[PDB]
PDB file of C-alpha atoms in Angstrom:
ATOM      1  CA  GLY A   1     -24.397   4.028  29.516  1.00  0.00           C
ATOM      2  CA  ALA A   2     -27.214   4.148  26.929  1.00  0.00           C
ATOM      3  CA  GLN A   3     -29.039   1.019  25.662  1.00  0.00           C
ATOM      4  CA  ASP A   4     -31.502   2.690  23.221  1.00  0.00           C
ATOM      5  CA  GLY A   5     -29.123   5.642  22.574  1.00  0.00           C
ATOM      6  CA  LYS A   6     -29.222   5.363  18.741  1.00  0.00           C
ATOM      7  CA  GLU A   7     -28.945   9.157  19.132  1.00  0.00           C
ATOM      8  CA  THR A   8     -25.473   9.772  17.620  1.00  0.00           C
ATOM      9  CA  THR A   9     -24.158  10.813  14.180  1.00  0.00           C
ATOM     10  CA  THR A  10     -22.173   8.802  11.761  1.00  0.00           C
ATOM     11  CA  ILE A  11     -18.974  10.103  10.134  1.00  0.00           C
ATOM     12  CA  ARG A  12     -17.940   8.607   6.763  1.00  0.00           C
ATOM     13  CA  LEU A  13     -14.474   9.064   5.223  1.00  0.00           C
ATOM     14  CA  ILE A  14     -13.848   8.538   1.472  1.00  0.00           C
ATOM     15  CA  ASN A  15     -10.257   8.504   0.110  1.00  0.00           C
ATOM     16  CA  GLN A  16     -11.120   9.993  -3.354  1.00  0.00           C
ATOM     17  CA  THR A  17      -7.393  10.491  -4.219  1.00  0.00           C
ATOM     18  CA  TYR A  18      -4.371   8.907  -6.012  1.00  0.00           C
ATOM     19  CA  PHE A  19      -2.951   7.048  -2.891  1.00  0.00           C
ATOM     20  CA  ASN A  20      -3.853   4.893   0.179  1.00  0.00           C
ATOM     21  CA  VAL A  21      -3.802   6.276   3.797  1.00  0.00           C
ATOM     22  CA  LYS A  22      -3.095   4.415   7.105  1.00  0.00           C
ATOM     23  CA  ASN A  23      -3.306   6.948   9.928  1.00  0.00           C
ATOM     24  CA  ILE A  24      -6.349   9.246   9.894  1.00  0.00           C
ATOM     25  CA  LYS A  25      -6.986  11.189  13.128  1.00  0.00           C
ATOM     26  CA  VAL A  26     -10.440  12.700  12.886  1.00  0.00           C
ATOM     27  CA  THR A  27     -11.943  15.185  15.369  1.00  0.00           C
ATOM     28  CA  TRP A  28     -15.690  16.134  15.328  1.00  0.00           C
ATOM     29  CA  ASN A  29     -16.033  18.337  18.408  1.00  0.00           C
ATOM     30  CA  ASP A  30     -13.689  19.820  20.970  1.00  0.00           C
ATOM     31  CA  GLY A  31     -12.403  16.537  22.473  1.00  0.00           C
ATOM     32  CA  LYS A  32     -14.282  13.986  20.304  1.00  0.00           C
ATOM     33  CA  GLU A  33     -11.572  12.409  18.157  1.00  0.00           C
ATOM     34  CA  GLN A  34     -10.578   8.838  17.178  1.00  0.00           C
ATOM     35  CA  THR A  35      -8.259   7.133  14.589  1.00  0.00           C
ATOM     36  CA  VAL A  36      -8.937   4.980  11.496  1.00  0.00           C
ATOM     37  CA  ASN A  37      -6.835   1.931  10.479  1.00  0.00           C
ATOM     38  CA  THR A  38      -6.351   2.349   6.690  1.00  0.00           C
ATOM     39  CA  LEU A  39      -8.337   3.604   3.679  1.00  0.00           C
ATOM     40  CA  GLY A  40      -7.711   2.070   0.282  1.00  0.00           C
ATOM     41  CA  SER A  41      -7.331   3.832  -3.030  1.00  0.00           C
ATOM     42  CA  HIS A  42     -10.850   5.394  -3.470  1.00  0.00           C
ATOM     43  CA  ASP A  43     -12.125   3.324  -0.479  1.00  0.00           C
ATOM     44  CA  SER A  44     -14.496   4.380   2.304  1.00  0.00           C
ATOM     45  CA  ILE A  45     -15.204   3.735   6.029  1.00  0.00           C
ATOM     46  CA  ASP A  46     -17.911   4.951   8.388  1.00  0.00           C
ATOM     47  CA  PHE A  47     -17.916   4.979  12.166  1.00  0.00           C
ATOM     48  CA  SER A  48     -20.134   6.158  15.026  1.00  0.00           C
ATOM     49  CA  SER A  49     -19.635   9.610  16.557  1.00  0.00           C
ATOM     50  CA  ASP A  50     -20.208  10.117  20.328  1.00  0.00           C
ATOM     51  CA  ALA A  51     -22.581  13.155  19.979  1.00  0.00           C
ATOM     52  CA  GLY A  52     -26.112  13.521  18.537  1.00  0.00           C
ATOM     53  CA  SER A  53     -25.232  16.607  16.440  1.00  0.00           C
ATOM     54  CA  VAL A  54     -22.023  18.262  15.186  1.00  0.00           C
ATOM     55  CA  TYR A  55     -20.835  21.463  13.444  1.00  0.00           C
ATOM     56  CA  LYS A  56     -17.002  21.024  13.264  1.00  0.00           C
ATOM     57  CA  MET A  57     -14.465  18.495  12.044  1.00  0.00           C
ATOM     58  CA  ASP A  58     -10.663  18.811  12.336  1.00  0.00           C
ATOM     59  CA  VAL A  59      -8.976  15.962  10.475  1.00  0.00           C
ATOM     60  CA  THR A  60      -5.243  15.181  10.160  1.00  0.00           C
ATOM     61  CA  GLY A  61      -3.863  12.294   8.087  1.00  0.00           C
ATOM     62  CA  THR A  62      -0.922  11.203   5.904  1.00  0.00           C
ATOM     63  CA  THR A  63      -0.530   9.485   2.477  1.00  0.00           C
ATOM     64  CA  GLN A  64       1.377   6.416   1.405  1.00  0.00           C
ATOM     65  CA  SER A  65       4.170   8.836   0.313  1.00  0.00           C
ATOM     66  CA  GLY A  66       4.459  10.293   3.837  1.00  0.00           C
ATOM     67  CA  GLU A  67       2.609  13.462   2.886  1.00  0.00           C
ATOM     68  CA  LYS A  68       0.388  15.179   5.478  1.00  0.00           C
ATOM     69  CA  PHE A  69      -3.042  16.730   4.935  1.00  0.00           C
ATOM     70  CA  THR A  70      -5.598  18.417   7.177  1.00  0.00           C
ATOM     71  CA  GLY A  71      -9.298  19.251   6.996  1.00  0.00           C
ATOM     72  CA  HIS A  72     -10.162  22.221   9.216  1.00  0.00           C
ATOM     73  CA  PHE A  73     -13.973  22.664   9.331  1.00  0.00           C
ATOM     74  CA  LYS A  74     -16.510  24.463  11.509  1.00  0.00           C
ATOM     75  CA  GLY A  75     -19.458  24.899   9.088  1.00  0.00           C
ATOM     76  CA  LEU A  76     -21.093  21.472   9.363  1.00  0.00           C
ATOM     77  CA  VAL A  77     -24.810  20.888  10.054  1.00  0.00           C
ATOM     78  CA  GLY A  78     -27.236  17.915   9.928  1.00  0.00           C
ATOM     79  CA  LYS A  79     -27.237  14.431  11.539  1.00  0.00           C
ATOM     80  CA  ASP A  80     -24.403  12.896   9.423  1.00  0.00           C
ATOM     81  CA  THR A  81     -21.026  13.969   8.051  1.00  0.00           C
ATOM     82  CA  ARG A  82     -18.901  12.777   5.083  1.00  0.00           C
ATOM     83  CA  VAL A  83     -15.374  13.698   3.928  1.00  0.00           C
ATOM     84  CA  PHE A  84     -14.182  13.933   0.305  1.00  0.00           C
ATOM     85  CA  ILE A  85     -10.397  13.599   0.551  1.00  0.00           C
ATOM     86  CA  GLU A  86      -9.300  14.963  -2.876  1.00  0.00           C
ATOM     87  CA  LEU A  87      -6.260  16.853  -4.313  1.00  0.00           C
ATOM     88  CA  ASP A  88      -5.849  20.512  -5.373  1.00  0.00           C
ATOM     89  CA  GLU A  89      -3.250  23.328  -5.915  1.00  0.00           C
ATOM     90  CA  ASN A  90      -0.454  21.137  -7.364  1.00  0.00           C
ATOM     91  CA  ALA A  91      -2.086  17.679  -6.890  1.00  0.00           C
ATOM     92  CA  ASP A  92      -1.221  18.314  -3.209  1.00  0.00           C
ATOM     93  CA  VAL A  93      -3.527  16.601  -0.722  1.00  0.00           C
ATOM     94  CA  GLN A  94      -6.409  18.726   0.494  1.00  0.00           C
ATOM     95  CA  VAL A  95      -9.640  17.686   2.210  1.00  0.00           C
ATOM     96  CA  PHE A  96     -13.134  18.674   1.053  1.00  0.00           C
ATOM     97  CA  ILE A  97     -16.744  18.057   2.154  1.00  0.00           C
ATOM     98  CA  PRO A  98     -20.234  17.879   0.562  1.00  0.00           C
ATOM     99  CA  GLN A  99     -21.633  20.817   2.540  1.00  0.00           C
ATOM    100  CA  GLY A 100     -24.930  22.537   1.731  1.00  0.00           C
ATOM    101  CA  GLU A 101     -25.409  25.866   3.535  1.00  0.00           C
ATOM    102  CA  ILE A 102     -21.957  27.058   2.362  1.00  0.00           C
ATOM    103  CA  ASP A 103     -22.834  30.563   1.142  1.00  0.00           C
TER     104      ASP A 103
END
């Protein structure tokens, strides 16, 4: 019940891959999760996140070709988060992030 509570992060998904997706669960705490409608070929979406700060993100989505990826993270910082959905290993769908303190 805030009215000046512009005191929350944003999360911003980018589908930097060779498909479209239609079913992204994202999590950004223990118990803060929501779902995202669709993300075009190389498209992007951003949405509000119900906490002022965040260090983890546990994502779970699926491709056009019914192929399921995750993004298991616990090393976030800062007052925003992005997601670079990309491919690796065999052009299999991974998830990546533009992190900074990752040493």
